[PDB]
Amino acid sequence: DAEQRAVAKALFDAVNKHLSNPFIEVEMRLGQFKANFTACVSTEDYERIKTYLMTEMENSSMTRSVTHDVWRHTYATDENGNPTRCVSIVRKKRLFVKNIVVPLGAYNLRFAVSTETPTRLKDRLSITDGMFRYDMTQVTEKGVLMHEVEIEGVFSSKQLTESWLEELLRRAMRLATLRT
Ligand SMILES: [Mn+2]
């Protein structure tokens, strides 16, 4: 009856709260071997990858964000670069990691699949081309400045296909070999 419906609704809401919304992140990160794989590119190669992406872009769209990181707690920043407050808290567990065999002269590529479930400073610029998101991040994690580039997409319950993976590897190889 009516009381039963109130209990079941509460059980339903409590179940979903304990489920959360667990999505899957598939990413291909550029990097080098130089404590082995370092997910960074040179400054000059970084600016040329960006030149490539802005030339390629046609949707007149991008997102920039300066955040502070420290389960990871992400803190926003105001107009002067000072922290505001947490805008997200997420646990990232890597499920699958793989080194890609790249052509000679190319940047190395690391393939990573992670579950994300709702100190470093990140200045990130993100572009979308088709069903792929490009992230260009300048990271500082211990006084060291790293130029990071990755291509990625997120899935949950948007499902992952072999076609999307095939194009992800194609698009990543294009950035990895940009200088050659
Ligand atoms: Mn990422």
CA of 69 from ligand 1 middle (Å) equals 13
Q: Exposure pattern of 42-71 as b/e (b: 16+ CB <10 Å)? A: eeebbeebbeebeeeeeeeeeeeebbbeee
42 phi/psi in degrees, rounded to 5: -70, 155
The experimental technique behind this entry is X-ray
CA of 152 from ligand 1 middle (Å) equals 7
CATH no., domain 23-176? 3.20.100.10
Strands (E), the chain: 23-33, 37-38, 63-69, 72-77, 83-100, 108-117, 120-129, 132-140, 145-155
Residue 151's closest CA among 20, 56, 80, 34? Answer: 56
First to last CA, the chain: 71
CA of 54 from ligand 1 middle (Å) equals 20
> If you ran DSSP here, which 8-state letter would residue 60 be given?
-
Residue 84's closest CA among 76, 92, 94? Answer: 76
What residues does each domain of the chain span? 23-176
Under 8 Å between Cβ of 66 and 122? yes
Binding site for Mn(2+), residues?
A: 25, 27, 150, 152
CA of 12 from ligand 1 middle (Å) equals 32
CA of 79 from ligand 1 middle (Å) equals 24
CA of 150 from ligand 1 middle (Å) equals 7
Torsion sign (Cα): 116, 34, 128, 61: positive
Separation of alpha carbons 157 and 75, rounded Å: 28
Q: Nearest 5°: CA angle at 146, between 142 and 149?
A: 140
Within 8 A by CB and 6+ apart from 85, the residues are 75, 76
Q: What is the resolution of this structure in A?
A: 2.2
Q: Nearest 5°: CA angle at 124, between 122 and 128?
A: 155
Binding site, residues?
A: 25, 27, 150, 152
Instruction: Give Cα 116 to chain centroid, integer Å.
Output: 11
Q: State how far the alpha carbon of 65 is from the alpha carbons of 53, 129, 176, in Å.
A: 18, 19, 24
Q: State how far the alpha carbon of 27 is from the alpha carbons of 61, 82, 118, 150, 157, in Å.
A: 21, 29, 19, 7, 18
Query: For strand 23-33 and strand 108-117, is the pairing parallel, antiparallel, or unpaired?
Result: antiparallel
